[PDB]
Design an enzyme around this catalytic site. Structure first.
Site, PDB file in Angstrom:
ATOM      1  N   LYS A  77      20.071 -25.968 -15.195  1.00  0.00           N
ATOM      2  CA  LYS A  77      19.431 -25.544 -13.975  1.00  0.00           C
ATOM      3  C   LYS A  77      18.604 -24.286 -14.129  1.00  0.00           C
ATOM      4  O   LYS A  77      17.756 -24.002 -13.304  1.00  0.00           O
ATOM      5  CB  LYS A  77      20.472 -25.348 -12.901  1.00  0.00           C
TER       6      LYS A  77
HETATM    7  C1  LIG Z   1      22.447 -30.307 -11.821  1.00  0.00           C
HETATM    8  C2  LIG Z   1      23.386 -30.724 -12.719  1.00  0.00           C
HETATM    9  C3  LIG Z   1      23.313 -31.986 -13.287  1.00  0.00           C
HETATM   10  C4  LIG Z   1      22.313 -32.939 -12.965  1.00  0.00           C
HETATM   11  O1  LIG Z   1      20.929 -32.646 -13.240  1.00  0.00           O
HETATM   12  P1  LIG Z   1      19.712 -33.340 -12.402  1.00  0.00           P
HETATM   13  O2  LIG Z   1      18.622 -32.781 -13.149  1.00  0.00           O
HETATM   14  O3  LIG Z   1      20.027 -32.756 -11.126  1.00  0.00           O
HETATM   15  O4  LIG Z   1      20.005 -34.737 -12.606  1.00  0.00           O
HETATM   16  C5  LIG Z   1      24.329 -32.323 -14.165  1.00  0.00           C
HETATM   17  N1  LIG Z   1      25.352 -31.438 -14.493  1.00  0.00           N
HETATM   18  C6  LIG Z   1      25.398 -30.228 -13.958  1.00  0.00           C
HETATM   19  C7  LIG Z   1      26.418 -29.378 -14.298  1.00  0.00           C
HETATM   20  C8  LIG Z   1      24.414 -29.871 -13.068  1.00  0.00           C
HETATM   21  O5  LIG Z   1      24.451 -28.637 -12.513  1.00  0.00           O
END
Ligand SMILES: *Cc1c(COP(=O)(O)O)cnc(C)c1O
Ligand code: HEM
Ligand code: HEM
Ligand SMILES: *Cc1c(COP(=O)(O)O)cnc(C)c1O
Lengths: 491, 493
Positions: A77
């Site tokens: 993120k």
């Molecule tokens: C956000 C997130 C995902 C998923 O990613 P997207 O890009 O939202 O599919 C998977 N694992 C964790 C820990 C996340 O924070």
């Protein structure tokens, strides 16, 4: 209130030239010798080979892992968080000193709170009550304000994290919701940077990509660029049981809440493009935590639960692949967020993921009484040091528990530690024993199992075997347990 | 069989000796390949990030740089010496496949060794003091290491010390080795060969001061030797916790306390690998400084680092004052916050250990010291868990209410239900009007007294969405963060 699940207005379709795009694209940049700030430590994440787990499950292919937990905030993120901010700053929408409000599973919230801490924005995170306290401690340390929402709240409802985010935004001047569910900067970050990194690290050769889905930005941006620049690659999406993201809809039929954090939703995010996902797989909590722990134990990758979901699917989906082909897996975040959860055995037991029938040696199911204990002499806390030396030597003892006049055990005291402390001038013979007492210990019954002792010894050096009063049947340390087992070895 | 960790060093290095005269096998840093064969290759090449706020907050004129070592695969600087010590041993022929490795440690070396062991297939036994964090234990347990603890205040001389217990374990286990970070040359040499080259390359050779906290001393020793050779003007500043004896002159070491909360630095003996001759100046640090500054590193610079990093920067803002514009100070940041998630990162722990005075509240806004009763509460209508959905919808609408706490026939509060969630659940077909309310109940909440402060409420809202105001039985009202916001903003106008 703008809906997170509104149908996308994007007019992209496979085959359109990149020139036709209205979006601002950003080229990845070489990292400088010295980083002006930590935010530049986002991207360029390592691609590590999985050496054991794939062969354990019979994969013939090369299994690779894109380790995203090496980003500055520790999660995938951190990428979108930067991008979403930067683009906003270029939009002129985000002004210095402004407040940023964001609904999140936590990781985007961490990246945004981090960037806010650096760039001087106020930061308000809105996350569901289910999410780990570790994320809260981190967010709190970054200076972010925190708001929680009930986990089972419908996204339509006012009480949902999205709804609460919007309701907060309406009451706060100079506040913005960058909105990861709708903002293009999210998938575009992965289209511009992450996919380019994957393509470059793999020399363009790539047979399958497995990714867990939340907002869908990662799989969307990666899959779009991959479909354009490496058409043969298959895109495999992973959705938790209880979520509705997966296709076909028949797969979604099921539990509604789940322990795994960061993936799955009760609505389809606008940024998600399910058209580019060639095939979906459902995952559950047991698989996720089992595999994450396996990732740690076998591959040494300190990754979170979604990573486990992802690999757990990959060992299935990649079975069709054969030698010379390769499957890449995304590993979204670190164990830091789950230190007291799946990493913890007690939590796993408490949540029913670990059955007690937890691989162990022959001696594990033996009573402590079989160790061959001897009851030690007891001393008062107020006894003096040299006196204890004389007592202990005179009886041939090398250590004595320190027990109170009222019979409460205060701790432990050793001959050698005392001689060492005296010889070093740390204490005086006339000094009270409390200056050198080992205050920390754990108690055990004669009927306790040796394995229980072994768990106890991972926290304490001393284990006092005791009755139900001031009565120590014996003192046991790891060395004693070792001596017993090793003696039993000789037969 | 017990070799002393504090035995005087036999090394015959002295500043000025040609590198050619060295008997040790040296390893060149190598470029990382596009795909890593295993995670152990993700060690070294750690980022050098500039500190933007803290130095200027304390009046530094110089450029303050941080060598961020927590980006290593195991999360600490120890991952370096873990790999090296193993690899060299493997070259020695001493370490055989399937062999057991025993190591005394503060944890980080143990984590790195357990990691490498998990990858390369060695049995791994860690011996660490009872003081060290549970997080390290959880990680080591996850990596498959066996774990043994020793009392914190045990003298290193004593049988109960982590060093002594490590040796005693070694004597009883066949095919076991103690790599011994306290004596092994591979420890400081790893820093001489790799870390120092990285610092020199990142700094383009130009470097005025280096500040480093000391434990085994391998980091400061390995860095300082190469720096004294390739950048003589740079000053070497060492950081030693109060209660430790590493620092010179001995006058600095005189103290009341002997134990301290900070992990990974300081010792009751001088490790063989440490070379105090190359340390130009020492500074003593305490726990308060360390944690305050670590928290400051996180809050200001966004660097998710542990306590020794805080000790180091806390010294750096003092020691670097002599420096002026155009000069630069490099600081070592040994490990990540992951090991201290429930310690200094946690406010309750900081309170409990007395590091945080409650007063220093003073940071807080005007509304912080106000009673909850001033919120303008209204007592809600309660419902049984057994009540049905459409019925509750009717009751709430008829009363003009938007939500109702769910309380038991016995009067225990079970949770909360909102009109909007019900309507949403119904419209989606998830639930029927005739259905029980418990299908849609919000089970999680927290209680508060009417006389509680608003700030306490603000803390509660960081874990729960709902806060129920209650007497000792009875709900006087329901409060969320939005309500607190509305109140504050209303009073503001
Ligand atoms: C956000 C997130 C995902 C998923 O990613 P997207 O890009 O939202 O599919 C998977 N694992 C964790 C820990 C996340 O924070
Ligand atoms: C040739 C390539 C592309 C074209 C021509 C294109 C075109 C557009 C246009 C015109 C819009 C705005 C429509 C409107 O509001 O009226 C849009 C929105 C969007 N685009 Fe693209 N796009 C392209 C590629 C991409 C790619 C590769 C991504 C991500 C990987 C992406 C992500 C998005 C997102 C998330 C939105 C927001 C949708 C919404 O607000 O409803 N686009 N695109
Ligand atoms: C010209 C350079 C050097 C020479 C000639 C040299 C020489 C030696 C010798 C001969 C020994 C072993 C003595 C013995 O066991 O009989 C030794 C040990 C050691 N060296 Fe060096 N050394 C050099 C540089 C370094 C450097 C740069 C480091 C680390 C930064 C280092 C770290 C060590 C350590 C930790 C020991 C172990 C001491 C002991 O066993 O008691 N040496 N060195
Ligand atoms: C080991 C360690 C140090 C000190 O490193 P030396 O190279 O031993 O001086 C500092 N902080 C932490 C966390 C450590 O583990």
């Amino acid at each position: 209130w703008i809906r997170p699940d509104a149908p996308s207005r994007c007019t992209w379709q496979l085959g359109r030239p990149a020139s036709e795009s209205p979006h601002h694209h950003t080229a990845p940049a070489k990292s400088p010798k010295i980083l002006p700030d930590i935010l530049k430590k986002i991207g360029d994440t390592p691609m590590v080979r999985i050496n054991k787990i794939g062969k354990k499950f019979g994969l013939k292919c090369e299994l690779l892992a894109k380790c995203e937990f090496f980003n500055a905030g520790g999660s995938v993120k951190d990428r979108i968080s930067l991008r979403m901010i930067e683009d906003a700053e270029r939009d002129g929408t985000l002004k210095p000193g402004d407040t940023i409000i964001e609904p999140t599973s936590g990781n985007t919230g961490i990246g945004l709170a981090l960037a806010a801490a650096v760039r001087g924005y106020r930061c308000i995170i809105v996350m569901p009550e289910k999410m780990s306290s570790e994320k809260v401690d981190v967010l709190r340390a970054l200076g972010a304000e925190i708001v929680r929402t009930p986990t089972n709240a419908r996204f339509d409802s006012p009480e949902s994290h999205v709804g609460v985010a919007w309701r907060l935004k309406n009451e706060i001047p100079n506040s913005h919701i960058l909105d990861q569910y709708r903002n293009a900067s999210n998938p575009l970050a992965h289209y511009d940077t992450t996919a380019d990194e994957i393509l470059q690290q793999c020399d363009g050769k790539l047979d399958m990509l497995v990714a867990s889905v939340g907002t869908g930005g990662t799989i969307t941006g990666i899959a779009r660029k991959l479909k354009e620049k490496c058409p043969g690659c298959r895109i495999i999406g992973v959705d938790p049981e209880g979520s509705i993201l997966a296709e076909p809809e028949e797969l979604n039929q099921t539990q509604t809440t789940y322990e795994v954090e960061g993936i799955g939703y009760d609505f389809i995010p606008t940024v998600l493009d399910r058209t580019v996902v060639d095939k979906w797989f459902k995952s559950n909590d047991e698989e996720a935590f089992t595999f994450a722990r396996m990732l740690i134990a076998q591959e040494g990758l300190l990754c979170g639960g979604s990573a486990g979901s992802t690999v757990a699917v990959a060992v299935k989906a990649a079975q069709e692949l054969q030698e010379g082909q390769r499957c890449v897996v995304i590993l979204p975040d670190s164990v830091r967020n789950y230190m007291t959860k799946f990493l913890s055995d007690r939590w796993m037991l408490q949540k029913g993921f670990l059955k007690e029938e937890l691989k162990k040696p022959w001696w594990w199911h033996l009573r402590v009484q079989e160790l061959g204990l001897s009851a030690p002499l007891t001393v008062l806390p107020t006894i003096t040091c040299g006196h204890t030396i004389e007592i202990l030597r005179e009886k041939g003892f090398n250590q004595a528990p320190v027990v109170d006049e009222a019979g409460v055990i205060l701790g432990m005291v050793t001959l050698g530690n005392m001689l060492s402390s005296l010889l070093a001038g740390k204490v005086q013979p006339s000094d009270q024993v409390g200056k050198v007492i080992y205050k920390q210990f754990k108690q055990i019954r004669l009927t306790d199992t040796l394995g229980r002792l072994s768990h106890i010894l991972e926290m304490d050096h001393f284990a006092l075997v005791v009755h139900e009063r001031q009565m120590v049947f014996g003192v046991v340390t790891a060395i004693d347990l070792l001596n017993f087992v090793a003696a039993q070895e000789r037969d």
